[PDB]
Design an enzyme around this catalytic site. Structure first.
Site, PDB file in Angstrom:
ATOM      1  N   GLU A  48     -45.608   2.460 -58.185  1.00 41.39           N
ATOM      2  CA  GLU A  48     -45.568   2.750 -59.615  1.00 41.39           C
ATOM      3  C   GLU A  48     -44.245   2.229 -60.178  1.00 41.39           C
ATOM      4  O   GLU A  48     -43.179   2.593 -59.684  1.00 41.39           O
ATOM      5  CB  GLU A  48     -45.722   4.270 -59.832  1.00 41.39           C
ATOM      6  N   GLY A  64     -37.418   9.451 -57.045  1.00 39.83           N
ATOM      7  CA  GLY A  64     -37.858   8.084 -57.333  1.00 39.83           C
ATOM      8  C   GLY A  64     -39.337   7.987 -57.659  1.00 39.83           C
ATOM      9  O   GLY A  64     -40.067   8.979 -57.584  1.00 39.83           O
ATOM     10  N   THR A  65     -39.782   6.778 -58.005  1.00 39.81           N
ATOM     11  CA  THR A  65     -41.180   6.543 -58.383  1.00 39.81           C
ATOM     12  C   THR A  65     -42.063   6.576 -57.139  1.00 39.81           C
ATOM     13  O   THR A  65     -41.565   6.496 -56.018  1.00 39.81           O
ATOM     14  CB  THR A  65     -41.394   5.192 -59.110  1.00 39.81           C
ATOM     15  N   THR A  66     -43.374   6.681 -57.337  1.00 41.71           N
ATOM     16  CA  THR A  66     -44.295   6.811 -56.211  1.00 41.71           C
ATOM     17  C   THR A  66     -44.590   5.448 -55.594  1.00 41.71           C
ATOM     18  O   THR A  66     -44.709   4.446 -56.301  1.00 41.71           O
ATOM     19  CB  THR A  66     -45.622   7.484 -56.624  1.00 41.71           C
TER      20      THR A  66
END
Lengths: 244, 250, 241, 111, 235, 231, 195, 243, 240
Positions: free
Chosen positions: H46, H29-31
């Protein structure tokens, strides 16, 4: 989920038999032989205990023969604990009938309900069947003396003489050979003990490896009596027919 | 969420065995030896208190349990399974008997109830059988003294004397030689102590042996006086001191 | 072998899922130890905060179950917290139903029973934890009772748990062979704590700063944990010896 | 004891012509000897060229109208936007009313 | 094994796809919609000549204005018919009017994916639902065990369906009379049937606004068979 | 592979294959397009037929006066989900006298689909939806996928070959976003977008389906002769 | 409802039951048969609350007919009467009890004896030589106490009954519109047509 | 083996492989991050811009619980939403019975116990998110991170998703260089920077930044989104630092 | 509750549990039904590796459902009891609400519906039973014979047979039963029924059961001799 671990106890094989019923019957075939013989004046129940130890308490013991009510008894072949579950059910069923109709339950009606309970475990609920076959011995004023068997399939049938458990093949042949319709109880007693004597897997048939019961017209006029034999009574009746 | 295991985990194999029951019996085999002997005026049940570390206080772990004032139990196999069976057995003595008849159940009937509980763990959905065999000793007014064995299948049998677990084959042989119908309780305690020495490895004293009797009524153990018909529990646990007194004259 | 995925017997009469739950017990690589004073019960456990980003005060495996009972866990934190919440609820309910404080040994039995159920009923997994309960019981005095994933439990003179548990165990057995008594013959809990830390040091062969340990003490009517400061003051006294 | 019903007064009237129909009502709303409002409408356009009034206990009246309006909306959703004829509205309303046969809406309804 | 509600990697439901195979093994059923009515015809397919063929019931009334024919595991259809009949009568009770054919069909189709681990498997039968209503006139619908339904000018289902459908593709036009449709159904049935089509092993029915849903007697269908061979001979 | 038996199982790389297979039914679906200006929002959907004798399956469903959606994938699943939306819009009206925000409609759908991806026995929904509406903060377009992921866009498309229309809309962004106050010009751009996804075939009169909602326009659906204006 | 009587003589049981059905100030019917055959040798008459009476009677009939088919056998009068009693004893503690009193007249073919059971809505059962429910009993019991003999014929039983019906038509305030009489014996159940 | 095919099964080492597989979905997944500050906490994430067509600012991912708690997560977004819905029910029920808003440690265990419960049975799947959350209560600010196993701790700063390592290193520098504390307005700026730094490990598509915060002095102890001048001011401070 | 979908579709579109239930029917003792002009006869083989049977008390193979309808079966005996009981309850319930005994078609439709339900409910297997249901509708003289099978499909038959070797005896009936001219009496119909069973059975000893059903609830079982008379007599017509 949990489907992974489900054995599916209630499915047909491709041949159209019920695996678990077949395998329960295989289990029963290794249990102590029990024999029922029906005479014109009563019924015998005789059964062989599972390979005893000298330290077993023989007189306060019961493993094969149980009382369902005053007019009906069963002999058990299979798992004892499974059988006790069904026996208590059957005892309660009998009392409900007596409570409802003020009459003792006809033998077949009791037999049918127990067989229906067994049948249910083969068709729904996903539980294992009861590993038990019964020989029912009883009296009612419609059919008089009656013998039935039921097995894990919930199928039941009536007999003049029948065995369940180990060596029923040999036992049935011997019963077929010597059984006669006009026979009396005391002849049937002898036939039962001689049949066990010849099919047993032990060296010799002694009192301490047996359970024995009669259902006679054997008290005061028209009324029926159940006799579960004490050890000494089996010892005597074993001599009285000359097996020891 | 919720239990979706509503199917049996014990079932018949093609040879007719019930695998899980056989395997439970195997766990019982590995268990520490326990036994019981029936005398004319009592019953004795005994086992080895095999401790897990010496830092453990093994008096806090009772292998021999009072079920009613006249009934006791001991086991071989899985201790935790036994502990919950004792909890249930104690409760069923009340719910299914004492709360109805105003008196404690006779030995065979309590045994019958425990056996029922164990049979159900052999057929009900989503459970395994209990991994224990029980020896239940008791007294009741109309049957006198009795001793029963209960196995993982729910089957139970009355014994004059027997043993279960690890060294049970040897111990059953020993008891066959020494048992007669004339044994007085004290003789049966002595035979129990001899039989148990065979199967015990390490220390063999009153701190490593657990032993109880079903014998005479104990008025001093009742806790009150003034009801003539209440005479006290027949179940008594032997103390560490009482066991050692009998081990010197061995 | 599906007898290895759920809690049914294997052909040799074993419960693999229970055995593997014991192996999860050591996942945290922490050792814990408990001893009894005259007046108190002390439990200590190693505290390891690897990540610098962690708030070290929130990293703990010691729990105040009730005013009188403390519990230390060996095993992963999610299972440990699950056990702690249940034990807290059980202790509160016992007090409400029966009108007195739940004894340490009784809570231990109760949690041991719950664990037994997970070993018999298929739909529940065992918790991968060992639970050491401590108190100064009003009837029994200083008390240590320990639970595992098999549902076994027993009281202890002293005990230890974790990967290097045998080292600590034998260390303690050797002391009790020498001392010839059931406990640390000491008046103050501060000195019983000092004993505990001292015998942990010999047995593990390592030194501790104030942030390498975590300590819980039980006395009559309270169980409490120590701050980094109370521990430093305890480390300091061992050193000046 | 709590009484779940009240009486909000007013009166209504409906007349049908050859190619039209009217449904009229006063706009007064009362409890006991007090006026709650001099203008509180109790005759409503329910869609599909149906007007409705449920006069008596206003809380029951509003609940009924709301349930019927909602019924019209779902009739469209469920039967491909078909127009609900006046006879069909009436039968539907019978079932709305009779569903509370043992705890009635205290209203006289006219559509 | 694998759960009853599982998607294949191609994004289809295994159990639904498998029930579609069972329907392919079913006896043939055909329906044709006209501006004068909708005809429904089926192949009775008695498994043995001792079986009394009039007891084979693969065309069924749902209400006066709605009829239904079936193909596949036809015992599965009893409860769908029962639901259909109740939904129709119930709608008339609540609204004092006839229920729309599409609405009825949607209701039957709502049953379809109500299976899982609600019934244990999808239905193994497909239905042709035919009727009239005032808003959309004569209509024919094919209801599948996927819960999907499709309106059709004409449609075949069952074993002879891929053949029959191509034939219906060619023969259907927007101006067929009822009589033309009856013959056409008879004709296409004789083509795909194993045994020789007669009045005992096939059956016709229609629904018209004026007389509702009627199943044709064997005498009446016999004539339409006679009239069909005479048409084919004469060119 | 070994990990695609049910939705309750993660693969070793953290994938949920049953959800991914549900996503695949969308990809075999007939194409549909959504796009909006600041005053209107439009759905265009290419309907598929069974053969020449059949109807062209509806792909557009009205949820409320101010909200509706188009579908690609399993139609019964769209009917279940649209019915839930109808109910949620309706509950907002009856209880709060408030037209349901398109954004909440999106969150409610995500949560409904999510449940079916974490529990045993159920399956994921096998349908994707494009949701348009006009609420108290103007025109909106939403993309629903049965993974539970819902996303607000100026325009998009789903179904087979939806990649063409989606690139077109990506290029056209600055044009259509300001077709304010003009119904027929937002539609024409939508019809153009969908044309970038046709093969072997083009938009006919029983084949094309359009819906519009906006500032002074109830959600209404055009089929048949009423789309001829646009071919 | 109102008048139901039973007399058991040497070789039969006779049931007499009034024909009137009344609601408010209107006799709605004057040929009502307040009886159901439970089995070929067992008859049950009934009186009590409107609706309840027939619903209960037919429910019992359905159960006994079901038993008969299942066992291919006829339950004894005693067995049936115990079944009926139990149903009423359950009912009296239900949310809405059956307000129905019954007489069961049967010929027991195993014993070759006629049998008459009187059971009220509470499940109070009694076997009697003669019985009555309602206000009837306040005249007929003492009358039968005087004129009844244990060894009477079916024909003497019918005359004894005529005496009862005469007294009731003389002293009872309501017009019960005569009785339908039925005889239960070794050959089953038949109805006397001119009474 | 096959120990990894069913949730809640122990492998022979004592692991639950299904949870470890859920962790893989989180790493994919995104940060997202959180920084604990002087009197508050800051959360940022993010958001990959998949396409021109996403409406900027209108796909919010940080979520409020009660009025004083922020939650952000990486992994399967719907799982995170489900967890926050539960958190909201837990917060409402605490407030209903006890009147005071739920303390952050109290709230952290409610989420923990619920997530842990999804590792107990084979009939549910573990959560495919790691969740960073926290806020301000009567005892000050608290920041927490919670894994698919139900494991959680209190953090000085925390990060997860694809850029977790880069962010972790960046967070560690701030903890070493500011042992007295970071201010809330300071922490907002650092958050922007770290999301920009951490976007390195994910640079196919460019991204939209989103920040939120609770501070006793700057937001009155309530959770609010950072928009407008304060957002752009922090975007700029981030831009400055990558160049 | 135990829930497993036990009857499900396989890739070829078969439901194996239903098809395996038919195998259980095939293994069951043979049963035949033949309808005449004015009667229906039901015949049933009983296997003879069972001597020492008590025939007074063993459940007979033809069961009265009501006084005017009978049911016989091939397959699992225990399974058949459940269907018979349900059918018996429904028959009394029909009499109670409609005030008329069931039609044979209606009773058949009910039993068939029960069988079908067990092919698409969770936690249950299908009935390992097919049935023949015969009788006369109330106040009607037209004979009625229906068959049901595990799937739930049912239908009317001029004559029909089920169980082991029913393919052999269906063969027999197919060439020997004339639609146009049905066995115009009881005697003729019983004979044809016993002839068909002899194709498969052995000695017509305690091996054939016959039950005759005539209009208005006239149902009678033959005993050994009455059957034996048919056995003897046909064998004598055979030496030709």
């Amino acid at each position: 989920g949990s489907r992974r671990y489900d054995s599916r106890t209630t499915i047909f094989s491709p041949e159209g038999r019920l695996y678990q019923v077949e395998y329960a019957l295989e289990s029963i075939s290794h249990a102590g032989t029990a024999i029922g013989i029906m005479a014109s004046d009563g019924i015998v129940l005789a059964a062989e205990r599972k390979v005893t130890s000298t330290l077993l308490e023989q007189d306060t013991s019961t493993e094969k023969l149980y009382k369902l009510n005053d007019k009906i008894a069963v002999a058990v072949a299979g798992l004892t604990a499974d059988a006790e579950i069904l026996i208590n059910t059957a005892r309660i069923h009998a009392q409900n009938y007596l409570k409802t109709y003020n009459e003792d339950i006809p033998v077949e009606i009791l037999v049918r309900r127990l067989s229906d309970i067994k049948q249910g475990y083969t068709q729904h609920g996903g539980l294992r069947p009861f590993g038990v076959s019964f020989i029912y011995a009883g009296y009612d004023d419609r059919y008089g003396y009656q013998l039935y068997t039921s097995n894990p399939s919930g199928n039941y049938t009536g007999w003049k003489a029948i065995s369940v458990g180990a060596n029923t093949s040999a036992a049935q042949t011997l019963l077929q050979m010597d059984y006669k319709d006009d026979m009396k109880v005391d002849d049937a007693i002898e036939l039962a003990l001689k049949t066990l004597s010849k099919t047993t897997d032990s060296s010799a048939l002694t009192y301490d490896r047996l359970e024995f019961a009669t259902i006679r017209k054997g008290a005061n006029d028209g009324e029926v009596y159940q006799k579960i034999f004490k050890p000494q009574e089996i010892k005597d009746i074993l001599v009285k027919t000359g097996i020891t | 969420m919720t239990d979706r295991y509503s199917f049996s985990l014990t079932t018949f194999s093609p040879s007719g065995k019930l695998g899980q029951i056989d395997y439970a019996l195997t766990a019982v085999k590995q268990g520490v030896t326990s036994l019981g002997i029936k005398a004319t005026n009592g019953v004795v049940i005994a086992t080895e208190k095999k401790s897990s570390s010496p830092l453990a206080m093994s008096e806090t772990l009772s292998k021999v349990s009072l079920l009613t004032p006249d009934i006791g139990a001991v086991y071989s196999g899985m201790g935790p399974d036994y502990r919950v069976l004792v909890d249930k057995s104690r409760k069923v003595a009340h719910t299914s008997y004492k709360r109805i008849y105003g008196e404690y159940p006779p030995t065979k009937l309590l045994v019958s109830e425990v056996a029922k509980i164990m049979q159900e763990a052999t057929q009900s959905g989503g459970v395994r059988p209990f991994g224990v065999s029980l020896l239940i000793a008791g007294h009741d007014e109309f049957n006198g003294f009795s001793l029963y064995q209960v196995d993982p299948s729910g089957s139970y049998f009355p014994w004059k004397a027997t043993a279960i677990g690890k060294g049970s084959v040897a111990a059953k042989t020993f008891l066959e030689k020494r048992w007669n119908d004339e044994l007085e309780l004290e003789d049966a305690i002595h035979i129990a102590l001899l039989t148990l020495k065979e199967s015990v490895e390490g220390e063999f004293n009153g701190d490593t042996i657990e032993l109880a009797i079903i014998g005479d009524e104990n008025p001093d153990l009742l806790g009150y006086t003034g009801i003539p018909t209440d005479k006290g529990p027949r179940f008594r646990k032997l103390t560490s001191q009482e066991i050692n007194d009998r081990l010197e004259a061995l | 072998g599906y007898d290895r995925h759920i809690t049914i017997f294997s052909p040799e009469g074993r419960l693999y899922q229970v055995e593997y739950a014991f192996k999860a017990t050591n996942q945290t690589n922490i050792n814990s130890l408990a001893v009894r004073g005259k007046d108190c019960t002390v439990v200590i456990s190693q505290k390891k905060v690897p990540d610098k980003l962690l708030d070290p005060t929130t990293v703990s495996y010691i729990f105040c179950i009730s005013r009188t009972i403390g519990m230390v866990v060996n095993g992963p934190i999610p299972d440990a917290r699950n056990a702690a919440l249940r034990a807290k609820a059980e202790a509160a309910e016992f007090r409400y139903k029966y009108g007195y404080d739940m004894p340490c040994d009784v809570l231990a039995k109760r949690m041991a029973n719950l664990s037994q159920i997970y070993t018999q009923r298929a739909y529940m997994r065992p918790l991968g934890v060992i639970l050491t309960f401590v108190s100064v019981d009003e009837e029994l005095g200083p008390s240590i009772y320990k639970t595992d994933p098999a549902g076994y439990y027993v009281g202890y003179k002293a005990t230890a748990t974790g990967p290097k548990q045998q080292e600590i165990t034998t260390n303690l057995e050797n002391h009790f062979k020498k001392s010839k008594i059931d406990h640390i013959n000491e008046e103050s809990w501060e000195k019983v704590v000092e004993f505990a830390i001292t015998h942990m040091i010999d047995a593990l062969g390592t030194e501790f700063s104030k942030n390498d340990l975590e300590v819980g003490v039980a006395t009559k009517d309270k169980f409490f944990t120590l701050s980094a400061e109370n521990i430093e003051e305890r480390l300091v006294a061992i050193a000046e010896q | 004891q709590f009484n779940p019903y009240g009486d909000n007064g007013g009166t209504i009237l409906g007349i049908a012509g050859e190619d039209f129909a009217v449904l009229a009502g006063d706009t007064r709303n009362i409890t006991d000897y007090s006026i709650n409002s001099r203008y509180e409408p109790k005759v409503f356009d329910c869609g599909d060229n149906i007007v409705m009034s449920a006069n008596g206990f206003a809380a029951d009246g509003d609940a009924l109208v709301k349930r019927f309006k909602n019924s019209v909306k779902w009739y469209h959703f469920d039967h491909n936007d078909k127009k609900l004829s006046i006879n069909s509205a009436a039968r539907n309303i019978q079932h709305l009313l009779y569903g509370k046969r043992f705890f009635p809406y205290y209203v006289h309804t006219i559509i | 094994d694998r759960g009853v509600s599982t998607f294949s990697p191609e994004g289809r439901l295994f159990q639904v796809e498998y029930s579609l195979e069972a329907i392919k093994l079913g006896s043939t059923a055909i329906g044709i919609a006209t501006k004068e009515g909708v005809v429904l015809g089926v192949e009775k397919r008695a498994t043995s000549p001792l079986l009394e063929s009039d007891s084979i019931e693969k065309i069924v009334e749902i209400d006066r204005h709605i009829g239904c024919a079936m193909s596949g595991l036809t015992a599965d259809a009893r409860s769908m018919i029962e639901h259909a009949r109740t939904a129709a009568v119930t709608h008339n009770l609540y609204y004092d009017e006839d229920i729309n054919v599409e609405s009825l069909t949607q209701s039957v189709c709502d049953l379809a994916l109500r299976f899982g681990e609600l019934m244990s498997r999808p239905f193994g039968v497909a239905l042709l639902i035919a009727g009239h209503d005032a808003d959309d006139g004569y209509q024919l619908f094919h209801a599948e065990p996927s819960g999907t339904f499709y309106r059709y000018n004409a449609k075949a289902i069952g074993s002879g369906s891929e053949g029959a459908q191509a034939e219906l593709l060619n023969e259907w036009h927007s101006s067929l009379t009822l009589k033309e449709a009856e013959l056409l159904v008879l004709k296409i049935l004789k083509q795909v049937m194993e045994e020789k089509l007669d009045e005992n092993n096939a059956q016709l029915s229609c629904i018209t606004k004026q007389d509702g849903f009627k199943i044709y007697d064997n005498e009446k269908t016999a004539e339409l068979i006679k009239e069909l061979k005479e048409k084919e001979a004469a060119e | 592979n070994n990990y695609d038996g049910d939705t309750v199982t993660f693969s070793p790389t953290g994938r949920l294959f049953q959800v991914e297979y549900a996503l695949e039914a969308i990809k075999q679906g007939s194409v549909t397009v959504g796009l909006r200006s600041n005053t209107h929002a439009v759905l265009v959907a290419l309907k598929r037929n069974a053969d020449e004798l059949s109807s062209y399956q509806k792909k557009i469903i009205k949820c409320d006066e101010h909200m509706g959606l188009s579908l690609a994938g399993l139609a019964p699943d769209a009917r279940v989900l649209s019915n839930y939306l109808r109910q949620q819009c309706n509950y907002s009206s009856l209880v709060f006298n408030r037209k349901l925000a398109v954004e909440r409609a999106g969150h409610l759908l995500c949560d409904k689909a999510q449940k079916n991806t974490q529990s045993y026995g159920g399956r994921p929904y096998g349908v994707g939806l494009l949701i348009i509406g006009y609420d108290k903060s103007g025109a909106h377009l939403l993309e629903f996928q049965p993974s539970g992921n819902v996303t607000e866009l100026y325009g998009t498309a789903i179904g087979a070959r939806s990649q063409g229309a989606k690139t077109y809309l990506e290029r056209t962004l600055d044009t259509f976003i300001k077709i304010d106050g003009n119904p027929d010009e937002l539609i024409k751009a939508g019809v153009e977008a969908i044309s970038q996804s046709l093969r072997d075939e083009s938009l006919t009169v029983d084949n094309l389906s359009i819906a519009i909602v906006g500032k002074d326009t109830p959600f209404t659906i055009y089929d048949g002769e009423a789309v001829a204006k646009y071919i | 409802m109102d008048i139901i009587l039973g007399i058991r003589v040497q070789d039969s049981v006779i049931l007499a039951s009034s024909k009137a059905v009344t609601r408010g100030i209107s006799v709605l019917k004057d040929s009502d048969d307040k009886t159901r055959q439970l089995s070929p040798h067992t008859l049950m008459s009934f009186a009590g609350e409107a609706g309840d009476t027939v619903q209960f009677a037919e429910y019992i009939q359905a159960n006994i007919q079901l038993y008969s088919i299942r066992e291919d056998y006829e339950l004894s009068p005693q067995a049936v009467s115990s079944f009926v009693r139990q149903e009423l004893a359950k009912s009296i503690r239900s949310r809405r009890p059956y307000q129905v009193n019954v007489l069961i007249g049967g010929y027991d073919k195993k014993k070759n004896k006629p049998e008459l059971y009187q059971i009220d809505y509470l499940g109070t059962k009694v076997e009697l030589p003669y019985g009555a429910h309602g206000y009837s009993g306040f005249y007929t019991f003492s009358l039968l106490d005087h004129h009844y003999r244990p060894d009477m014929t079916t024909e003497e039983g019918l005359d004894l009954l005529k005496l009862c019906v005469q007294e009731l038509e003389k002293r009872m305030p309501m017009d019960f519109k005569g009785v339908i009489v039925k005889i239960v014996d070794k050959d089953g159940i038949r109805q006397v047509d001119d009474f | 083996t096959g120990y990894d095919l069913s949730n809640s099964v122990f492998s022979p080492d004592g692991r639950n492989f299904q949870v470890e597989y859920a962790v893989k979905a989180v790493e994919n997944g995104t940060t997202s991050i959180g920084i604990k500050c002087n009197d508050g906490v800051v959360f940022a994430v993010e958001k990959l811009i998949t396409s021109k067509l996403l409406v900027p600012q209108k796909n919010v991912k940080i979520q409020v619980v009660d009025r004083h708690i922020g939650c952000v997560y990486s992994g399967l977004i719907p799982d995170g939403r489900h967890l926050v819905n539960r958190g909201r029910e837990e917060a409402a029920s605490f407030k209903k019975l006890y009147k005071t808003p739920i303390p952050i440690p109290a709230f952290a265990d409610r989420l923990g116990q619920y997530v842990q419960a999804h590792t107990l049975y084979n009939s549910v799947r573990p959560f495919g998110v790691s969740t960073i959350f926290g806020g301000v209560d009567k005892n000050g600010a608290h920041l927490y991170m919670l894994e698919p196993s139900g494991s959680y701790w209190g953090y000085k700063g925390a990060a997860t998703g694809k850029g977790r390592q880069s962010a972790k290193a960046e967070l560690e520098k701030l903890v070493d260089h500011h042992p007295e504390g970071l201010s809330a307005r300071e922490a907002v700026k650092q958050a922007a920077k770290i999301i920009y730094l951490a976007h390195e490990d994910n640079k196919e598509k460019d991204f939209e930044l989103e920040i939120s915060w609770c501070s006793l002095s700057e937001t009155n102890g309530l959770h609010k989104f950072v928009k407008g001048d304060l957002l752009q001011e922090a975007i700029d401070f981030a831009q400055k630092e990558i160049n | 509750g135990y829930d497993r979908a036990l009857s499900i579709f396989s890739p070829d579109g078969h439901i194996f549990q239903v098809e395996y239930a038919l195998e259980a029917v095939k293994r069951g003792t043979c049963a035949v039904g033949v309808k005449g002009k004015n009667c229906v006869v039901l015949g049933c083989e009983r296997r003879s590796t069972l001597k020492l049977q008590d025939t007074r008390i063993t459940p007979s193979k033809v069961s009265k459902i009501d006084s005017h309808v009978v049911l016989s079966f091939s397959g699992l005996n225990a399974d058949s009891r459940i269907l018979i009981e349900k059918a018996r309850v429904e028959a009394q319930s029909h009499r109670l609400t409609l005030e008329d005994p069931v039609t044979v078609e209606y009773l058949t439709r009910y039993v068939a519906g029960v069988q079908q339900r067990y092919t698409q409910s969770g936690g249950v297997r299908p009935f390992g039973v097919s049935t023949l249901i015969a009788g006369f509708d109330p106040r009607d003289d037209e004979p009625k014979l229906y068959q049901t099978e595990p799937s739930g499909i049912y239908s009317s038959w001029s004559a029909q047979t089920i169980g082991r070797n029913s393919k052999t005896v269906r063969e027999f009936l197919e060439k020997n039963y004339d639609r146009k001219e049905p066995p115009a009496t009881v005697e003729e119909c019983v004979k044809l029924t016993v002839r068909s069973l002899l194709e498969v059975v052995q000695t017509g000893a305690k091996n054939i059961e016959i039950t005759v059903v005539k209009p208005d609830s006239d149902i009678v079982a033959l005993s050994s001799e009455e059957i034996n008379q048919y056995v003897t007599q046909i064998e004598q017509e055979k030496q030709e």
